[PDB]
Nucleic acid binder design. Structure first.
Ligand SMILES: Nc1ccn([C@H]2C[C@H](O)[C@@H](COP(=O)(O)OP(=O)(O)NP(=O)(O)O)O2)c(=O)n1
Ligand SMILES: [Mg+2]
Ligand SMILES: [Mg+2]
Length: 323
DNA sequence: GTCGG
DNA sequence: GCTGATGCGC
DNA sequence: CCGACGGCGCATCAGC
């Protein structure tokens, strides 16, 4: 990538602020700057040039000048040397261990993978599964495997009830050649914003995917959101595929376009778009777009493009939403 | 950390 | 048990 | 200056 050295530096700063400092707005600011620089179509020559981009301010411009001049950032070189920052940043890589829990574990002398494995009884269910698949969860998923997973999920959903519609969203729907996980949007005509005419709609699908041994583990599960683990089947004598993260979101069927907009992302694109909506006098969530008067009644939406129209954005195909 | 009013 | 906060994640 | 920063599901806990 054209400015990969810079965007990597900013991401590392973002992670430090989130995981160690617990300064969430600094985390968001660093990721916004990294995002806008990532899509800038020139090799950046100076901090001043970058400060012209929205989300890059004075402090990030100065860091870019240091990085361009020396290839490194003294602030990060010191952070990498610090044992407590290093430990906390490591522990947060386990799914279910956040900044607070990582600092608590370090206080208790739990700070390596070996320590975690020795202290499984001190982990909640989510953390215990995150530890179990720690290596697998850091692997990426080739799009070819995403296509196999898509075929399994859609066909098994079809067998439960041909009226389900399952849509793979996330980075996959944005056309990524690899994904960190699989995100599945689910609808069924019995579940609308006006009524739930059938119970266990999400459960039935989860159950079926467990029955055929696709879903292997559950991190969390409610009426509309499942968060778990899945695995492709392998052939005779074949090494097994890595276990993968899977999220499933049941959305009211009449609210599919707001739901698919949300679940297609990226997260930064959603943040930019919802922030823009506010400046335009609307609020967007995964169910509705509503005017700000306090939020008013939902506006009619019959395509993803209707949502862009309301906030006066030209439409952006999913592949162009990877901010 | 950055931005807009 | 319920409700509201908080952590963690999408 | 300085308030705002997207919006919400599930797990866990504290207080009643
Ligand atoms: N903070 C976040 C995180 C996620 N999402 C939405 C947008 C994202 O596209 C989708 C799925 O989340 P994800 O973490 O799986 O991200 P992804 O875009 O699929 N990328 P990846 O899974 O790493 O390949 O949920 C969001 O709105 N806000
Ligand atoms: Mg994803
Ligand atoms: Mg996901």
């Amino acid at each position: 990538t054209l400015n990969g050295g810079i965007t990597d530096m900013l991401t590392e700063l973002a992670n430090f602020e989130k995981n160690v400092s617990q300064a969430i707005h600094k985390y968001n600011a660093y990721r916004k700057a990294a995002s806008v620089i990532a899509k800038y179509p020139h090799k950046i020559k100076s901090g001043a040039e970058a400060k012209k981009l929205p989300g890059v301010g004075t402090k990030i411009a100065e860091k870019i000048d240091e990085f361009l001049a020396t290839g490194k950032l003294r602030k990060l070189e010191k952070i990498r040397q610090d044992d407590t920052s290093s430990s906390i940043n490591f522990l947060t890589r386990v799914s279910g261990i956040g900044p607070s829990a990582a600092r608590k574990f370090v206080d208790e002398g739990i700070k390596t993978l070996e320590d975690l494995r020795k202290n499984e009884d001190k982990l909640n269910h989510h953390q215990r599964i995150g530890l179990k698949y720690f290596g697998d969860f850091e692997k990426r998923i080739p799009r070819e495997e995403m296509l196999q997973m898509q075929d399994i999920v859609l066909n098994e959903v079809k067998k439960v009830d041909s009226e389900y519609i399952a849509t793979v969203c996330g980075s996959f729907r944005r056309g990524a050649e690899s994904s960190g996980d699989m995100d599945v949007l689910l609808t069924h005509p019995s579940f609308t914003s006006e009524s739930t005419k059938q119970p266990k709609l999400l459960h039935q699908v989860v159950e079926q995917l467990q029955k055929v041994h696709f879903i292997t583990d559950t991190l969390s599960k409610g009426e509309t959101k499942f968060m778990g683990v899945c695995q492709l089947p392998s052939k005779n004598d074949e090494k097994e595929y890595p276990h993968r993260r899977i999220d499933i979101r049941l959305i009211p069927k009449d609210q599919y376009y707001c739901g698919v907009l949300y679940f297609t992302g990226s997260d930064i694109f959603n943040k930019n778009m919802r922030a823009h909506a506010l400046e335009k006098g609307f609020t967007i969530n995964e169910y509705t777009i509503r005017p700000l008067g306090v939020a008013g009644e939902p506006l009619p939406v019959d395509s993803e493009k209707d949502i862009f129209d309301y906030i006066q954005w030209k439409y952006r195909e999913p592949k162009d939403r990877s901010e």
